[PDB]
Every structure is written in structure tokens, then in C-alpha cells.
Amino acid sequence: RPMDNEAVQFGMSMGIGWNLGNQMDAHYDGCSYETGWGNKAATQQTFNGLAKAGFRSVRIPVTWMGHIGNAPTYAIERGWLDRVDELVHMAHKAGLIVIINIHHDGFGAADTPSKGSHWLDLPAAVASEERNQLIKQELTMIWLQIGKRFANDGEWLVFETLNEIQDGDWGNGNNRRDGGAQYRVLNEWNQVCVDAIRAAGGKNETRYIGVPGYVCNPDLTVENLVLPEDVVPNRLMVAVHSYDPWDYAGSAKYNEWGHTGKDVVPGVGEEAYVGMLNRLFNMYIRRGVPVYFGEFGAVRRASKADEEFRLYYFRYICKAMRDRRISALYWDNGNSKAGNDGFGVIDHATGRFIGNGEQAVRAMIDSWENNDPNYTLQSIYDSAPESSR
């Protein structure tokens, strides 16, 4: 069976992981700074905390903007690359699989504290082939440098080519009516990144590389992503993100989820989420192509009864992922609030739990990891909590 191959095994080995979010990706006025959005800098204790909790992987999103020299060499500032290098190796010391990327360089929405500085510009590339050529040259120079730094680091280190590429309308815009022009350029960008990584030598030759589809949307991925042509077989993984359904998990307009919820996104619950996973399973996993959620999550709630629904969500979706051989990394931005943007469960400098974060972390990891054939999606379903409305 292709789903039993070495690649899918590797994907599964990431298990449930954790994002060091709003950290090396944080930026304003055109430059990234680790502490720029209010997290303290990560330490060895951070990564020790993750491994102790049972996370198998860690994603370290990195925004490069502000640390990139002028064309044509686009030289990366050594101090910045040093810190990325250091974090990667702290994570490795803790026994974690590690993903690094190009992150808010390609932020494509209007609401950015770095207006005008996002060089990785999809609409600009679609409007002009000469702009597309320039962006591709920068991508090549950047990934070449990154790969050259990490040429002696093996397959525990994963490169993810890009983050969430879009035109600002989050997949509901012109991408659905431009004759696939945006999807095509994104596909070209992923090819260029893979080419660069493979050209960087040494262990970049057989490194796993994660590639995403449009705005990391699973369906637009399944429907339009073209896996780049590679110099070796079975070393690409499909990266996706899910905060579905958004008005439960992300905006928290609704604070219950699933078949026992009353304050729910209308008609969007377990079946919908499983359907999305099924599409990924059939398109990729079933064919021996691994899939991982680079980001998933749902915000924290103020009420205990509401919080039980969040834990239910994690148990259910993470079980569904395991059953489909899909790994997933929880989005942690360090924010301890309830509601919108409230994703912090582990302190980014100390590795300790934030508030009641242990209960969330346990829900996700222990559901994915469970190896009892009597622990099933049905058993989680039947144990769903009681509405408080």
C-alpha cells in the first residue's frame, strides 16, 4: 500500500507538534524581530517543555523581511540566520522534528504593520512576468542560503517553502475567476523553492520539503496544487492549515461545536471537518504523499463549559487526523486571553504551561497518540460535552 511507504511514515512521525508563533515571524515597519509581538525569546527550556509534554515536532515560522540585502545577492544578515540556526539546534537537542519556512514575507492581506514591505507579492507577480521573475530570483537566493547553512543537518529538519500565499481575499477572491493564474504562479514559486533547496547541497538532497496550496486552504490545495518536479522521489509533503470552522475556532463568534453544541456555526460540525480530511487522505495519503497541518487550532474560552467544547474539538479532529495518517502542529502565539487570538498554551521563553493550557495540550496529543483500537471517532463523539445554552 502506498500509504505504508517511508514518506507517509515520516509525516506521521511529526505526530502532534507546536508552533513557535508570533515569534521569529513577528514584524513591523518592514523588519522582523523575535520579541516584536510581545513574546520573550525562546530558550532551551522552551523546547524541553514541548518534548516533555509529548509534542513530536515544532514549527519555527521565520519572517525574513528586514534581514535581506539588496538585489542581486539578497544576502541574509548573519545574526538573523544565526538565531534561526540556534533555535533549530535547541529543538534538535530536545528530540523534536523541526520545520522552518518563509512566513510573513508573503503575508497577502491589507492589514499588516509592514505596509509596502512584503516583497513576496502574488498579485504583483500575476500582473507582471518581470515582477514574477524577480520574486523567483529572491526566493532562489534565500533558499540557497538557508540550505547552505543547514547542509549538515539531516531529515529531522524540514523546509517548508512558503506560508499562506494569496491576494488578500483568503481564497474567496479573484483566484476563483482568473483562469487559474494565481494558482499557476504559486505552483511556479514552489517549483523554484524546491529547485533552490536541492541545489544547496549536502543533506538538502534528500530533505523532506513541505509545499502549500493557495492560502493553505485544504480544498484549494487538493484542487490546484501541483507537486513540484523533484530530483529525488518521495521527499515532498503537502502543508495545509485549518482553523475550521472559522467562526467557532478563530473569531469565536460561536462558542460551542459539534452535535451536542447549541451555540454552533450552523450546519458545520464533525461531518464537515472529517470530509475535509477525507479529501486530503484520498488525494495525497492514499497515494503515498504525506500531509501535515502546519497550523491548526481553536482559541481558548473564558467559561469552563465552553472550554470543554474546545477540548472535544481537539480530541475529535486530532483522532480523525491520526486515523488518516496526518500529522498536525498546534498554533501557539503566546497570547493568554480568551476569545479571538487566544492561542497561547505554553510560555515561549520558559516552556511552562500558560493557565489551563495543559488540558488543551493533553486533549490534542493524547487523542492523536492513542493506540487502543477501542478508542474511536465514535467513542469521542458519544462522549461530547453538554451545552451550557
Numbering used by the authors: 9 to 397
Q: Can you provide the manuscript's text about this entry?
A:
AC2aCel5A is an endo-acting cellulase that is encoded within the first reported cellulolytic PUL, originating from an uncultured Bacteroidetes phylotype. As previously reported, AC2aCel5A is an endoglucanase active on β-(1,4) glycosidic bonds between glucose units in soluble and insoluble cellulosic substrates and in linear β-glucans. The enzyme displays the typical (β/α)8 barrel structure associated with the GH5 family. The six closest structural homologues, which include all the biochemically characterized members of subfamily GH5_4, were identified using the Dali server and were used to produce a structure-based multiple sequence alignment using the PROMALS3D server. This allowed identification of the conserved catalytic residues, i.e. Glu172 and Glu303, acting as the catalytic acid and nucleophile/base, respectively.
The structure of AC2aCel5A was solved to 1.8 Å, and contained two molecules in the asymmetric unit. The final model comprised residues 9–397; no electron density was observed for the nine N-terminal residues nor for the final eight C-terminal residues, including the His6-tag. The native structure was solved to 1.8 Å resolution and revealed a narrow substrate-cleft, likely determining the specificity of the enzyme for linear and less substituted substrates. A surface projection shows the narrow groove stretching across the enzyme, with the active-site located in its center. A comparison of the active-site clefts of the GH5s shows that AC2aCel5A has a narrower active site cleft than its homologues, especially in the vicinity of the −3 to −1 sub-sites. This is primarily caused by the loop region between β3 and α3’ (red surface), which protrudes into the substrate-binding cleft and which is extended in AC2aCel5A, compared to the examined homologues (residues 115–126). Nonetheless, AC2aCel5A is unique in that it has an exceptionally narrow active site cleft, due to an extended loop region that seems well adapted to (only) acting on less-substituted β-glucans. AC2aCel5A contains a tryptophan “clamp” in its putative +1 and +2 subsites, analogous to what has been observed in other glycoside hydrolases acting on insoluble polysaccharides. Furthermore, in both the apo- and the complex structure, extra electron density was also observed close to, and between Trp178 and Trp254 in the substrate-binding cleft of both chain A and B.
